[PDB]
Write a protein that binds this ligand. Structure first.
Ligand SMILES: [Cu+2]
Ligand SMILES: [Cu+2]
Ligand SMILES: [Cu+2]
Lengths: 39, 274, 254, 274, 254, 254, 274, 39, 39
């Protein structure tokens, strides 16, 4: 159909950014934890 | 105030049928309660009753591990029966309540009023918060595997913190003849047990591989882990306990398994009732 | 409407009160004759009191079994009467069967729960476990056979008055009864373990784990109640919903 | 004088078929006897043969408990096979007779005529009254669960009284070097066993929890109780031992279980024979 | 009527007498060479006598297996001959199969019963168990492989001359033979237990319990005989009752 | 022909390289902070380094689970879209499901094989096992939850994007994932055995046998792959052999 | 050069289908390799890894018995899977290769480059010839019971002779402080193991019932015998591991096991493709 | 029918007396045993 | 048929000689081994 090509072209670009905003954060949130000595 | 009239209308019960159903409930439910009391009490006392009887057996290694593993067994099977057959979420709580009723009756009449032991020395005590949280997990998740995991973790973890208000004050130190004891230990020595000497206590003893500050915590997790297994196993045992068939025979004399089926549960039976 | 056509509870109440009174009498006998005549097993008074009670149990319980089982088997329903049974009378008979189950389960509660922690209680005020200790007499020789009789009688009634139970063999019921039944022969294992190197100090000892495995059969109440509820639903459909009787005779045929 | 002609007429066997059936019996029954001898003898000797071999191993604790539990196993399975397949009630007696035949052959040729031990020192002895009563119970009750209970009780209880006439005289006291011995003990010491020293005897030793006057009685009941279990278990094993199917295959190469059925046992086959 | 068309027993009798004579020869060899040359395992005479007998067994038993199995597999019936088999000849072949089973079971009796208590008898006149003790040679290296050959040969014959056995795989027969067969490799467990901390003093020791579990497979004679009796009844119906042959080829198809 | 319509591997490659880099970082952290700050568990530097890493794991792994599971469950296919799914897109989605399985299995390899012998290696250079030893932090608190997230995510994707997995419950897949999943709670058994009388000296100790029994569930890959191959053959028949789509919706109905 | 074109023509695969199948193989086979590495490595190290790690644990009693019994388990199941599903004979070899790859990776990175132990002290070593011969037996016989017998015998027998070239030179005698040691023993003492003292070695110790010249030989046969059992058992476990069904539900909410079937494997499907 | 109402009215009065003649006896037979010391 | 009577009359005389040539040999091959001390 078309909604297939489009719903799936939207989850390619959607999935490749929940990957790149989690890569960055998870490395920044764990340093803030490592370098801050929380606990 | 719940939705009972809708349930009764969906079941297509005339008022006499409703009254007959109410009589069935009023007859069968006390029977199930008494059976749970008896059988669950026997199972618990003959698998974990020794730590249950005495104050000085409640330790950091064996009591909080043995007790929940033994307790989860009947709870899982009764929860399976109730939930699968009638969608009733109060199985584990009912099991533990029956166990505690039986335990209190025997402690008051057997240990105290016959054997002259003090009541405070024979507090069992409770295992109820874990059963309640297991019931809540089963109701909220509706999945028995997620229930196995989370509820078994809760059952194995909440045992010691839930019993600490009862047996925490019994750990205050006392000095007798220049020797340090826990008050539970001095209570155990004070009230003579002719059949139970000191060396039979299966309690912690310390080890060179042991972290004394973490003992209970480790005992809190191991007892949890096995619980997650035990639940699952006994859940399948529930399917064994609900096996209801007849050995019918005919002609050559051959025996065949036969199942009696509910007519109301068939495809078109409810529509043809009217 | 008429309650009496499908419900009666006089026998259930009588059995319940009688079992409670028997248990109370056992408790009073234990509290009156254990410290004064039950401490030493070699004394003549120990014989006269506790072995006398044991003999009373050994003579009464077989008589109980004989009377109950013979009455149940003697007033039996023929295959003709079990084929044209009035479904209202079938509802009443299923209520009776549930009440027999309740009496049996009350006996199991008395045997396995109350008169067992009372035994652990006795195991700690005596030097070592004997064989006819005050406790044993009341349960091992009293409560144990008591529930067993009720169990057989329960099944007996069902497979004599309930056509379905006279037709096929209620698998769950079999185990539900056989369990506590086989618990009594486990007294041999108990004694053999106590007297020899299986140790005696703990009450939750491995030799006491035969009772738990045999009492796990009491959890077949799930299958028993499933059969009871299925038949009750079929009877409700037949009697009140004006449905065909064929649902009562279709699924338990050869 | 029994009803054999009626049975043969009901089976619809021509005289040549009757002769062929008689030849089948005369060929197969000795084969079953020899198989029972061999396998039952191996099982009994490798599970309970040590108490069987020597007079001084026949004690009040282990011999009357181990022997019936080991003996009931093959008896239950062979009784299942015979009763279920052919309605023949002589299973347990046949098993014990085969075991005793094998035992006597080996004791005479192995222990006595090769190893130079006296025959009286190696009496096995009998386990036959319990098997006979079990067979009678199975025939008279026709129910295998009532048979399990009553016959297992008989099998576990009658072992010691039935063997007492054989080994009772061996318990007469003797005094050697100022030490009291049973005559079986002095027979064991007199005839040297290079491979069997004294300390390997698994016999009674007494305990502070033991009632010496009741020992055998307790051993008579425990051995009974387990028998009631063992029978039942091995009865189900009989159903495993009678499993007779073929792995047939076709096309994709798929394997299916297939059962060969008796044509005479069908619904209308006997009527169409004529 | 003609007996010879469906019955023959010459091979069965020959095998029985030959096995009995072999066992008698083994007994005579044990009684003549055990006390004089079998006491010490390091003596040259022990080699020359008992290891010579062991070598004779190790050279003869594989030859026995080769000859028997090759003859059975070489004179095989084609699928054409097994589809139009004369039912009288099928009765004769089932008698032959039962006789092969009888020879196999006689071998099992010699291995597991007679030459085993004779071993316990030897275990008490020697200091400790060896590996090629007089007893072992006759059974472990003689009786054991002997019955195994017969077992294979038995099945071989059946699945070569009996169409049903050539069609499907007689599950019970498989176990009935595999059991005593797998008993021979259990000699490894026996030796490993004897030589190390599994103890050696008792003959009814836990390391000797592999033989009982493996010989429990000999109780699948129930299924074997059930198959034999079912086929015998079908053949009786076909041959003498003039019934259709379709009952012989209907239930063991794909 | 067009490869891209039924195949894509960017996410698989990214996950593989990311997992490899995370494992390499764990290895570098162990080799840089274990001998200098991981020898004593009571030192403040031990806290600041290894308990800091433990806290980082405890804060990041739940975030990983939340993000992955929420994204998978949020971009879900409705029952309408899963009923008229393009079979080429179904082939692509099955490739994606296999790649999710591959990522999960890479996590299991890192947890159970590499960072486990590295632990035995650490168990021999230290006096006794602790609870947050350099090794533990990287695997028990890092590798273990890591593969578990991937496992859930794998199933999640399948039962969200694969109609068959959204229809019935892939029994083999359940066990394949539940196994290594339940391995993490077995750390309780590990610690309880180490700290008490289950001994600690051996690495192949009976308390370490919970992991092998729970990882035997990883052998249900046979059933997983059987389902995958059956669906792949059906899709090949539908797409390229011009066969009817009814083979895709016939066997997994009620 | 094998017969691949005939196989592809019999499968009725268009070229795009062939390319898609090749991609399936290239994706799935590394996944199976990695899973075997991980799971088989965990199982082997936690059941038999202690004798695997150190040179002085490789003895004549426990190493050549424990190692093949543990190793045969995964091999039998993976061989079942491959042979039954795809007719591929390289199961056991693949399992052992994966185990050795994982072992070498961990020994180089964990034991040597992190714990500073020498590489020669941690040779595992090989178990490959037995797996290869088991694969060859399975391919040549095509029967899994004959494969069980012969291949289990090979697997249990060839372990010690196949490892002797690696660990034979380590048995050369050395004299330290007037005491005789094997060179493996002195290597074990030289390189300190803080967590592994001497007394934890489960190695031979000699016995009064032991024939020192036959020890390994006996260990070579026992390990064989159990292997013949273990294979068989795990072969059935393979059928458990290939169980592939779905829990589907409908209407009353009832759950039924449902199997997805291969359409190409049906009776007339291949003929109707054209 | 009628035989139902009557066969069942006869086992009510029949069962309530095998209960009251066993209650009495069992208490009289066990005392005669208790107070007589038989054995 | 006839091939049945003949194929089976040929395996009777065939089987009774693989029995009598194995009886003899096996006794001669094991003596040659016993009296020669091979090994
Ligand atoms: Cu007691
Ligand atoms: Cu021996
Ligand atoms: Cu560790």
């Amino acid at each position: 159909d078309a909604a297939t090509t489009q719903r799936e072209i939207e989850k390619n670009s959607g999935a490749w950014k929940v990957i790149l905003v989690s890569t960055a954060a998870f490395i920044v949130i764990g340093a803030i934890i490592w370098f801050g000595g929380i606990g | 105030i719940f939705r009972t009239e809708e349930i009764l209308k969906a079941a297509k019960m005339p008022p006499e049928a409703v009254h007959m159903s109410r009589l069935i409930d009023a007859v069968y439910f006390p029977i199930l309660i008494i059976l749970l009391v008896g059988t669950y009490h026997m199972h618990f006392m003959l698998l974990a009753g020794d730590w249950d009887f005495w104050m000085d057996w409640k330790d950091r290694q064996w009591w909080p591990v043995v007790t929940p593993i033994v307790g989860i067994t009947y709870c899982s099977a009764i929860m399976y029966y109730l939930w699968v057959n009638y969608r009733q979420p109060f199985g584990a709580t009912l099991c533990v309540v029956c166990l505690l009723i039986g335990e209190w009756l025997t402690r008051y009449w057997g240990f105290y009023w016959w054997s002259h032991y003090p009541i405070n020395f024979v507090t069992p005590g409770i295992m109820l918060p874990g059963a309640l949280m297991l019931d809540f997990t089963l109701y909220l998740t509706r999945n028995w595997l997620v229930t196995a995991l989370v509820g078994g973790g809760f059952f194995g973890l909440l045992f010691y913190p839930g019993n600490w208000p009862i047996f925490g004050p019994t750990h205050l130190p006392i000095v007798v003849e220049g020797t340090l004891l826990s008050m539970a230990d001095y209570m155990g020595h004070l009230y003579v047990r002719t059949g139970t000497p000191e060396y039979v206590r299966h309690i912690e003893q310390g080890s060179l591989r042991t972290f004394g500050g973490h003992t209970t915590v480790i005992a809190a997790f191991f007892s949890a882990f096995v619980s997650m297994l035990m639940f699952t196993v006994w859940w399948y045992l529930g399917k064994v306990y609900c096996t209801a068939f007849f050995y019918v025979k005919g002609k050559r004399g051959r025996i065949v398994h036969r199942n009696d089926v509910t007519a109301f549960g068939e495809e078109g039976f409810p529509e043809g009732i009217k | 409407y008429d309650m009496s056509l499908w419900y009666d509870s006089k026998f259930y109440k009588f059995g319940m009160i009688t079992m409670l009174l028997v248990a109370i009498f056992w408790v009073w006998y234990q509290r009156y004759f254990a410290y004064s005549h039950g401490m030493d097993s070699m004394e003549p008074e120990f014989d006269r009191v506790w072995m006398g009670l044991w003999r009373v149990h050994m003579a009464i319980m077989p008589l109980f079994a004989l009377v109950t089982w013979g009455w149940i088997l003697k007033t039996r329903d023929t295959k003709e009467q079990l084929d044209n049974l009035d479904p209202k009378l079938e509802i009443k008979r299923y209520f009776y069967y549930m009440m027999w189950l309740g009496v049996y389960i009350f006996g199991v509660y008395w045997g396995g729960s109350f008169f067992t922690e009372q035994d652990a209680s006795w195991h700690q005020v005596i030097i070592r476990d004997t064989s006819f200790t005050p406790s044993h007499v009341v349960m091992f020789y009293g409560s144990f056979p008591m529930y067993i009789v009720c169990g057989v009688a329960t099944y007996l009634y069902a497979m004599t008055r309930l056509p379905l139970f006279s037709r096929g063999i209620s698998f769950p019921l079999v185990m539900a009864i056989a369990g506590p039944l086989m618990i009594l022969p486990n007294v041999g294992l108990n004694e053999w373990g106590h007297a020899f190197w299986f140790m005696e100090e703990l009450f939750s000892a491995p030799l006491h784990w035969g009772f738990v495995v045999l009492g796990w059969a009491g959890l077949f109440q799930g299958g028993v109640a499933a059969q009871i509820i299925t038949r009750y639903s079929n009877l409700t459909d037949v009697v009140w919903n004006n449905q065909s009787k064929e649902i009562l005779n279709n699924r338990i045929v050869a």
